[PDB]
Design a protein around this ligand. Structure first.
Ligand SMILES: NC(=O)c1ccc[n+]([C@@H]2O[C@H](COP(=O)([O-])OP(=O)(O)OC[C@H]3O[C@@H](n4cnc5c(N)ncnc54)[C@H](OP(=O)(O)O)[C@@H]3O)[C@@H](O)[C@H]2O)c1
Ligand SMILES: NC(=O)c1ccc[n+]([C@@H]2O[C@H](COP(=O)([O-])OP(=O)(O)OC[C@H]3O[C@@H](n4cnc5c(N)ncnc54)[C@H](OP(=O)(O)O)[C@@H]3O)[C@@H](O)[C@H]2O)c1
Lengths: 298, 297
C-alpha cells in the first residue's frame, strides 16, 4: 500500500518504519534534519524491536496521491500541515489520524470525506534524528470517522496487523477519540500539575476520586454532544494508568523538554465543545489554565 | 483590658506584644519554648516597628476569666485548643478569632454566646522563640459573630486602635470571614500549585480570569448560605494581591517548611458547605486535592 506519513516525529517514524519493513511504499514527511538523517543513514528503530529501514523521506508531500495519508504531527500543527500537503490528497486518498486531542479528523474532512480516526497505545520517542525508540507495544484502534465502516478501513487494518501493528476496527471512532481525550485530560492534567508518574494518580484515593470527577465531566460533555462510548473512558483510564505506571505523561515531558503541549486540543477542546452546547466544565478549564501557566514559566 | 492570647505563634505574639505595650493585662498561651523565652528574656518585636515587652506567658490558660480571649492557633488545632483552655471562658469572657478559614467562630460558639469574628491583614512571622517579625501593617476588621454589634466589640476595637492595631468594626463579620476565605482559596490555591508569588496571579491574565472563576464559585457557595458581602470579594482579592505582590502565600510557605496547611478549613470548608447545601465546588475541590497532594510530595 502507498502510504505517506505527514509528520516524521516519534510515532510517525515508528509507524512509518514498521510499515516500511512489511514492504509497503512508505514516504515520510518531516523536518529537514529527519529527512537528511534518513536519506543518508536510514531510519533506526530500537527498543521493543530493533531494526533499520530506509523509507523515502522528504520535507514536501509528493504530488502523487497515496492510498493512505497518516496525520502524525502534533495537534497544533494539523491544519497548516494539511494545507501544506493538500496537493497529495487524491480522490480516493484516505486520511487517518492517530493523534491525541480532538478536532483533527474534522480538519481532515475539509479536504475529503475519506477520513478515519485512530488511537494507538504504542509508545514512541524520537531520541535522535533517524533514531526512534519503540518504548512500548500497544493496541491500535482505527475506524471510519465519525462512525460506520468501509472496505478500505479493513484493508488498512490488515496492512497494519501484517506490519506488526496490532489493529482492530471500530464503528465508533469518534467515541474512541473522545475516550482517549478524556483519559488524557485526567492524566496529562493531574500528572503534569503535580509532576508525578501516572500510577500515582490512581494510588492516591483523593487523586483517584478527583480523576473520576474530571472523567465524568468529560463524559457528560461528550454525551450531550450525542457521543456514546463503546468502552467507558474510566475503564480505559485505569487501564492506561496500569499500562504506564513507570511513565511521566507526555505533556509533563513536553514542559520538561521546553516543547509545546497539546492541552489546547485536549482540555481546551473539551471546554470549547462544552461551551458549544451550553455547558462549562470547570475542572478541564482549571487544568487547562494551570498547565498552560506552568508551561509559560518554562 | 485583660486579654489572654491562645496561641503564641506569629500573629498571636504580634497582637499580644502590641496589646502589652499599650498597657493591657496580657497573657500569652502557647508552646513552652515560646513561654520560656518570653518568661526569661521577654518578647521582642522587630520589623515594621521594633520594641520589647514582657507579658505573662504560660502553657495552660489560667482558670481566671479574661475580658477577652484571642484565638491565634492554626485552624486544625482550634477545637483542641478550645477544650484545653475552656476553663478560662467566663460568663463575661468574649472570644475573638483572628484565624483564617471558616468554622472557628462556630467552634467558639459551643462554649459561649460571647463570640466575635475578626480578620487581619497584618503580617507576622515568629523567626525565633521570643522574637516576632512584623512583616507588614494592615487593617483589622472585627464584629459580633455572625452579625450585629455590641458595646464590648466597640470597646475591643477601641483597645486595639489605641494599641497601634488599625481596627474597624463591621456588622457583617461572617461576610468578612467568607471574603477572606474566598481570597485565600484563590491565592493559596493557584499560588501554591504553581509555586509563584502572589503578584504573578495578576501578571498572567489567564490566572487572573480563572481566579475570577474560582472566586465567584466561592461567592455562590456563600450566597446560598444567606451570607452577603459588605465589599465584593473580588475587589478584596486584587486589593490583597497588590498589597502582597512579592510574597509567597502562607500555604506555600508551610509546604516549603513541611508544615501542615489550613486548606482543609479553606477550600475544604467551602466544599463542605457547598455539599451541605446541595451544591458542587469543582474548582475549590480540585484545588483542595492538588494542594493536599503537594504537601506529601
Ligand atoms: N509519541 C507517541 O508515542 C504517541 C503515542 C500516541 C499518540 N501520539 C500522538 O501522535 C501525535 C504525534 O506525536 P509525536 O510524539 O510523534 O510528536 P512529534 O515527534 O513532534 O511528531 C511531529 C513531527 O511532525 C513535524 N511537523 C509538524 N508540522 C509538519 C509539517 N507541515 N510538515 C512536516 N512535518 C511537520 C513536526 O516538526 P516540528 O516539531 O518542527 O513542528 C514533528 O517533527 C501527537 O498528537 C500524539 O499525541 C503520540
Ligand atoms: N501568620 C500571619 O501573619 C497571620 C495573619 C493573619 C491570620 N493568620 C491566621 O492565624 C492563625 C495562626 O497564624 P500563625 O501564623 O500565627 O500560626 P502559628 O505561628 O503556627 O501560631 C499558632 C501557635 O499556636 C500553638 N498552638 C496550637 N494549639 C495550641 C494550644 N492548645 N495551646 C497553646 N498553643 C497552641 C501552636 O503550636 P504548634 O505549632 O506546636 O501546634 C502555634 O505555636 C491562622 O489561622 C492564620 O491563618 C495568620
Amino acid at each position: 500500500m502507498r502510504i505517506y506519513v505527514l509528520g516524521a516525529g516519534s510515532i510517525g517514524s515508528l509507524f512509518g518504519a514498521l510499515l516500511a519493513r512489511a514492504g509497503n511504499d512508505v514516504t515520510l514527511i518531516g523536518r529537514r534534519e529527519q529527512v537528511d538523517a534518513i536519506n543518508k543513514n536510514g531510519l533506526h528503530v530500537f527498543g521493543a524491536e530493533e531494526f533499520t529501514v530506509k523509507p523515502k523521506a522528504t520535507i514536501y508531500a509528493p504530488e502523487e496521491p497515496p492510498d493512505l495519508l497518516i496525520l502524525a504531527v502534533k495537534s497544533y500543527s494539523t491544519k497548516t500541515a494539511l494545507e501544506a500537503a493538500r496537493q497529495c490528497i487524491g480522490r480516493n486518498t484516505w486520511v487517518l489520524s492517530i493523534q491525541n486531542g480532538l478536532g483533527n479528523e474534522e480538519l481532515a474532512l475539509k479536504y475529503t470525506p475519506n477520513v478515519m480516526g485512530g488511537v494507538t497505545t504504542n509508545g514512541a520517542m524520537l531520541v535522535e534524528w533517524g533514531k526512534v525508540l519503540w518504548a512500548g507495544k500497544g493496541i491500535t484502534v482505527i475506524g471510519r470517522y465519525p462512525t460506520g465502516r468501509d472496505d478500505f478501513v479493513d484493508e488498512v487494518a490488515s496492512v497494519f496487523n501484517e506490519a506488526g501493528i496490532d489493529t482492530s476496527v471500530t464503528e465508533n471512532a469518534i467515541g474512541w477519540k473522545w475516550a482517549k481525550a478524556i483519559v488524557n485530560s485526567v492524566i496529562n492534567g493531574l500528572g503534569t500539575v503535580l509532576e508525578v508518574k501516572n500510577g500515582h494518580l490512581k494510588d492516591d484515593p483523593h487523586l483517584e476520586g478527583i480523576s473520576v470527577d474530571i472523567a465524568r465531566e468529560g463524559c457528560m460533555v461528550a454525551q450531550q454532544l450525542g457521543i456514546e462510548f463503546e468502552i467507558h473512558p474510566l475503564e480505559l483510564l485505569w487501564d492506561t494508568i496500569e499500562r504506564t505506571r513507570e511513565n511521566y505523561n507526555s505533556t509533563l515531558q513536553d514542559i520538561w523538554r521546553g516543547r509545546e503541549t497539546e492541552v489546547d486540543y485536549i482540555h481546551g477542546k473539551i471546554v470549547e465543545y462544552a461551551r458549544s452546547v451550553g455547558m462549562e466544565a470547570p475542572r478541564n478549564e482549571l487544568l487547562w489554565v494551570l498547565v498552560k501557566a506552568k508551561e509559560r514559566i518554562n
